[PDB]
Design a binder for this molecule. Structure first.
Ligand SMILES: [Cl-]
Ligand SMILES: [Cl-]
Ligand SMILES: [Cl-]
Ligand SMILES: [Cl-]
Ligand SMILES: [Cl-]
Ligand SMILES: [Cl-]
Ligand SMILES: [Cl-]
Ligand SMILES: [Cl-]
Ligand SMILES: [Cl-]
Ligand SMILES: [Cl-]
Ligand SMILES: [Cl-]
Ligand SMILES: [Cl-]
Ligand code: NA
Lengths: 227, 219
């Protein structure tokens, strides 16, 4: 017999890796943990702005299965590496057309793609290597968005067959799951521990993704502030 | 889109429609689901938890001078929805009736408590008979079975009762799409009059905020 469910007071964040985290909160009275876990899990996927490379045109290359003399990687591998780079647009723009150019012997990392329009968050990631008799020139399209947009929908919007359209996975949070574990409070069994596991693609850390989700929850609720 | 407008529409003293907009398509549920749920599990009501009737030891007993036996009196008592006056969480209330009388909710009204549904029937007493009983009324959330109450008060003087505190009879939500397309969350709340729909909704918001507060330690 109570007029209020006990207010949980324990909270922990455990960093499993740079891209994964376990967030635990307890003790909740039975049913209350899940009452909150479900909406926060959903908000984790919708509360952070995402960016992705949507298309690329490589000078001297006709298609995504082509080759380039002077580049160690074939185009397919180049592209696989490019998709592992987590781009971010500098400023408030939704789309940037970025021109790149590299010459001479050169090993290109994420840090080498930082300029006025965009930045690569995982700057230590490798892209490609070119030899001394070569120049790699390409135009990259980076867009803001949410969710998954397949290459076909990109191609249509982009309007230019010289650009190789890319499948785009914009959402920073790739996985978010939870478990409701039983715990005791003052010797009684009717309590729970919420354990959320959050995995991002590296555009932001799991910690920030949860902060954005919690702020978003409060922002929605704030519409009720006036009696 | 994120909600910036709301409206409380009082259809009656026991029914209200609470609307909020705008939400992105498919995002309204993050608010609707938890709040609907808290409208059932965190709203604060009242119920008798135990009763002592003078001359009676058990639920299956009879009482000379009452048409109803004790078990039927209890069944009828369940339909009366009490309210504790003021902010007290508990009241031990003594009632006393005599002579020929039909007892309804309206007759159970004193400084401590009252009954919301005044027209509900409780029992009938015959001439030259008197009914005396003590009722324990409490404030709470959810439902508590007689067995837990029995073990709690540990007192054979009283018969423990199933206590149904929840004052919300129904809480639903509808998500309406508006035709730049957004959605509007509409929650409909019906109470039994122990508290108003607006009060019930404040209980649920307040519970939301307390439960979310543990997650603030992220910063
Ligand atoms: Cl921690
Ligand atoms: Cl549950
Ligand atoms: Cl260079
Ligand atoms: Cl080299
Ligand atoms: Cl080389
Ligand atoms: Cl899950
Ligand atoms: Cl434990
Ligand atoms: Cl009994
Ligand atoms: Cl009387
Ligand atoms: Cl017994
Ligand atoms: Cl519903
Ligand atoms: Cl609906
Ligand atoms: Na080559």
């Amino acid at each position: 017999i109570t007029t209020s469910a006990y207010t949980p007071t324990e909270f922990t964040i455990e960093n499993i890796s740079d891209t994964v985290a376990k967030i635990s909160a307890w003790p909740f009275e039975i049913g209350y943990g899940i009452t909150l876990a479900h909406p926060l899990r959903r908000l984790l996927y919708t509360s952070t702005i995402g960016y992705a490379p949507t298309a690329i045109h490589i000078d001297g290359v006709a298609h995504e299965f082509d080759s380039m003399r002077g580049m160690l990687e074939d185009v397919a591998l180049f592209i696989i590496n490019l998709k592992k780079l987590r781009f971010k647009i500098k400023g408030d723009s939704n789309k940037e057309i970025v021109e790149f150019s590299f010459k001479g012997s050169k090993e290109i990392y994420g840090k080498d793609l930082n300029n006025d329009q965009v930045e690569v968050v995982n700057k230590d990631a490798y892209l490609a290597t070119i030899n001394e008799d070569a120049e790699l020139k390409f135009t990259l399209i980076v867009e803001k968005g949410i969710g998954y947009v397949p290459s076909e929908e990109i191609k249509e919007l982009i309007n230019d067959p010289k650009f190789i359209a890319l499948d785009a996975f914009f959402t920073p949070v790739r996985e978010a799951t939870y478990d409701i574990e039983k715990v005791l409070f003052e010797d009684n069994p009717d309590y729970e521990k919420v354990v959320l596991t959050v995995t991002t693609d590296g555009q932001i850390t799991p910690n920030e993704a949860f902060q954005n989700a919690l702020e978003a929850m409060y922002k929605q609720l704030s519409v009720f502030d006036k009696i």
